[PDB]
């Protein structure tokens, strides 16, 4: 032979895992995140967009809607840590939202179901957006740090 | 101290045990109330610089 071969070989048998003790306990949101709050979207496709916050979905994501009609942002998933939660709020107390869950957004163009749903929600908000002036404009504008803005100083 | 360590041993065994006859270092002092009657504290100070020579 060219090499003399071990006197011992490892068991190719393969153990299983010690039974871990790490419960998936549920995530509590930071108090600034309350339904009807306008978020600022820090990263992502709709980075810099202002957006109403509807529901806290079971994968911890957040349900937002532009409304679509205002700034072009759909009912959509967004992460909670990629968001500056403002202090301006609208009453989402006549918006549906129960309909919407994780599987609602399975990957599987635009489903006609979605185009309609977008309209049931967005109509409701816009009803109530219009209840305070200028708000509807605010929501169509983006957010950018201007010169001499210091986030650690600013109030959102 | 060995002739004495005999005594304390017998005189205590023939009494009802409990003896302790190992030497122990000087233990710190206990709690005490030093009284003030006929004994008000006398305030002292440092004193200036003299020469006397």
């Amino acid at each position: 032979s060219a090499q003399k071969a071990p006197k011992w070989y490892p068991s190719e048998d393969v153990a299983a895992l010690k039974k871990t003790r790490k419960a998936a306990r549920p995530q509590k949101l930071r108090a600034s995140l309350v339904p009807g709050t306008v978020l600022i979207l820090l990263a992502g496709r709709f980075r810099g967009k202002r957006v109403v916050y509807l529901k806290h979905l079971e994968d911890n994501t957040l349900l937002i809607s532009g409304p679509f009609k205002v700034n072009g942002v759909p009912l959509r998933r967004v992460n909670a840590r990629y968001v500056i939660a403002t202090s301006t709020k609208v009453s989402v107390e006549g918006v549906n939202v129960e309909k919407f869950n994780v599987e609602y957004f399975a990957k599987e163009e635009i489903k006609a179901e979605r185009v309609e749903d977008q309209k049931v929600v967005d109509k409701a908000l816009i009803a109530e957006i219009k209840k305070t002036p200028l708000l509807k404009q605010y929501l169509s504008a983006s957010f950018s740090l201007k010169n001499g803005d210091k986030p650690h100083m600013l109030k959102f | 101290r060995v002739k004495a360590n005999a005594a304390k041993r017998a005189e205590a065994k023939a009494q009802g045990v409990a003896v302790q006859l190992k030497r122990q270092p000087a233990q710190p002092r206990e709690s005490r109330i030093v009284s003030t009657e006929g004994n008000v504290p006398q305030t002292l100070a440092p004193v200036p610089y003299e020469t006397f020579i």
Binding site: - | P25, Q27, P28, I33, S35, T36
Partner: protein, 222 residues
């Protein structure tokens, strides 16, 4: 073959019975402690109104932590540092206060900082960094039956039983103390508060007996 739950029962019900003893114990020191402490507070108060002056017992127990490093140390104190198990920098042991050690303590001020531990910092030392000497093996405490197996001899069948026999310098403080493997502190968190350390405490440095303050130091090195 029974044992399955039979002898599981025969112990689990006796492991119960021990914790019963421990609770009833630890609960007792608690009373002993606060009552022992309220005593002094009323003892001082009682003298003041009476006119007099309640002088406390001299401390009976000291905690020492080695400040100075390893090298360039003269033969004699270099010996005492060993007999106090302080063979490396920032480790630290308890010492029972008696003349035949008080001289030792003297002999090595330039290299240790030391003083008077509180129940709070004896507690937080044992709990967090207290190990046992069990055929050497520097063994973490972490369960009450580690103690019991080795200091159970002399009473002491719980971690707070340890603390009690330490903080009171009771009849078995030698073996209760030496059971504890020399402590192993970090550099102080805040820093040292002196600029140069190797002066006496009184002279704005870090060594020798700083007394009541040996705590804040320790609770920063822990």
């Amino acid at each position: 073959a029974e044992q399955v739950a039979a002898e599981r029962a025969a112990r689990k019900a006796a492991n119960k019975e021990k914790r019963a003893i421990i609770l009833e114990r630890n609960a007792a020191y608690q009373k002993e402690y606060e009552t022992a402490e309220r005593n002094i507070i009323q003892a001082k108060r009682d003298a003041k109104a009476a006119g007099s002056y309640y002088v406390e017992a001299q401390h009976k127990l000291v905690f020492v932590v080695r400040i100075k490093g390893i090298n360039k140390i003269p033969p004699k104190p270099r010996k005492v540092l060993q007999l106090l198990r302080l063979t490396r920098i920032n480790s630290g042991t308890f010492v029972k206060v008696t003349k035949a050690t008080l001289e030792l303590l003297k002999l090595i001020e330039p290299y240790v900082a030391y003083g008077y531990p509180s129940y709070s910092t004896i507690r937080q030392l044992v709990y967090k960094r207290g190990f046992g000497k069990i055929n050497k093996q520097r063994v973490p405490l972490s369960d009450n039956a580690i103690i019991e197996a080795n200091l159970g001899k002399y009473g002491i069948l719980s971690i707070d039983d340890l603390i009690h026999e330490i903080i009171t310098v009771g009849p078995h403080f030698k073996q209760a103390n030496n059971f504890l493997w020399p402590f192993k502190l970090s550099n102080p968190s805040g820093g040292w508060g002196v600029p140069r350390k190797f002066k006496h405490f009184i002279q704005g440095g870090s060594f020798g007996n700083r007394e009541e303050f040996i705590n804040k130091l320790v609770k920063s090195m822990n």
